[model samples]
Target chain A: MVQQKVEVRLKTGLQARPAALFVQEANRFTSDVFLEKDGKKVNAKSIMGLMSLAVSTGTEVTLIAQGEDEQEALEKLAAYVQEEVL
Target chain B: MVQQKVEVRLKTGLQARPAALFVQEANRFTSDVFLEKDGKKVNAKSIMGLMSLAVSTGTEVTLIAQGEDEQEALEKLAAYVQEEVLQ
Candidate 1:
């Protein structure tokens, strides 16, 4: 299991289309990925879960990955959110 | 009058919400701003016009600004299109 704190780099934060893209990226990994914010943890692969997070730019959250590709998953997802666009 | 050719650096190109923001940035300047691609041009300040342009990532387009603030407008608009977010 791996967990690391990450920050949202999206200009408009995670909403609408950006959230949708975040979910898609999470699904690419075999590891179980979750994002936690404010004591709540949600599956990163689910669009609904990401939307529920309602995270925006500059917000810090936790990224967790546990499985065969845990390390890669964490690194990739981190880069995705840090990017200016999806 | 200032006209410069610039490339689109956005990951998703200028579409949907990105295009909306692009237009908003263009509106911030008092100069007349326009974008030209593949021989056609449209007003950069209008969402409808930008959408019709259908600019994608890596596409090179012409940016034209004519007014008292042409230089500043061009610089800002160029930066927006070239940035990872609004650019």
Candidate 2:
């Protein structure tokens, strides 16, 4: 298992399109991933779950992953959230 | 409170766009709405909750609403899911 706190750099945060894209990215790996903010945690691979967080730009969140690709998933997803674009 | 089983007629099911639309529609109502599939229920107004069901075309899901506009919410949402297009 691996976890890291990263700030959301996407201009619009994880709204509909971006949240969907994030979920799609999380699905590409076999590891289980989750995003935590304000004490609420949601499945990273689930679009609805990610959207529920209503993560806005600059909000810091924890990215957690567990499985064969935990480390890679953590690194990639953490970077993905910190990007200014999808 | 009102509940009805609705058949998803959207060609692509409730994928990204459709699911987001569904959530948007659900949010327009003051009533609390939920979609249930395979015994699991999720908030209709929540995009992530609705997407978790992975509802596919032709799948029947129960629509439940509770609040002042339960009936209206149920009707609109049920019809929305049965439409072939978002239009």
Candidate 3:
């Protein structure tokens, strides 16, 4: 079980571009991406799915994935989150 | 924004290999992927983010994307979902 808890920044928060990039990168892994914000479950591979999160900047979301590549997926994902905090 | 609500079907449900494929495809576009199940929202990018969903077989979730390539993203996504419930 691969899991990561992170916070949302971007003034627009998890918008389409970043979301898409996130999804695209995640797709490479053979694990399911789950996003938890404020104790809610969300899909991480669907750009629109992340957007609907209505996740505002400063929101904290937990990322979870269980798959063969779950470890690598989480590592790369958490690493890419180098955006400014809104 | 590109959005498509789809179902989760797989002999093993949405396991790692398939989930990885889902994330890989979703990354091409410039949109944020959100998964909605039972009225709950999840992140679609983080591989670990998706597994936390704890989704079972036949579970349904929404695929949403809002960005420059949202339209293309949704079309390709909806189409790729053609995988068997187990694949």
TM-score, per-candidate, Cα-based: 0.42, 0.43, 0.40
Q: Candidate 2 regions off by >4 Å?
A: A1-86, B1-13, B84-87
Model 1 spans with C-alpha error above 4 angstroms: A1-86, B1-13, B84-87
Report the C-alpha lDDT of model 1 over A1-86, residue by residue, as the tens digit.
11111121222224446667777888887888777776887887886666455343455677778888887777777777667344
Collision count for each candidate, in order: 3, 3, 58
For TM-score, the strongest prediction is 2
DockQ-derived CAPRI band for the predicted complex in model 3: incorrect
Q: Candidate 3, which segments miss by more than 4 Å at Cα?
A: A1-13, A84-86, B1-87
Mind giving the per-residue lDDT tens digits that candidate 3 earns over A1-86?
11222221111235445667778888888888777665667778886676555343343456677777787877666555434233
Give the Å error, residue A32, model 1.
Answer: 28
Which prediction has more favorable lDDT, 1 or 3? 1
Candidate 1, B11-38: lDDT as tens digits: 2224446568878788888888887766
* Ranked candidates, highest lDDT first: 2, 1, 3
Which stretch of 10 consecutive residues in model 1 chain B shows the poorest summed lDDT? Answer: B1-10
- The DockQ scores of all candidates, in the order shown, are 0.03, 0.02, 0.02
Report, to 2 decimal places, the DockQ of model 1: 0.03
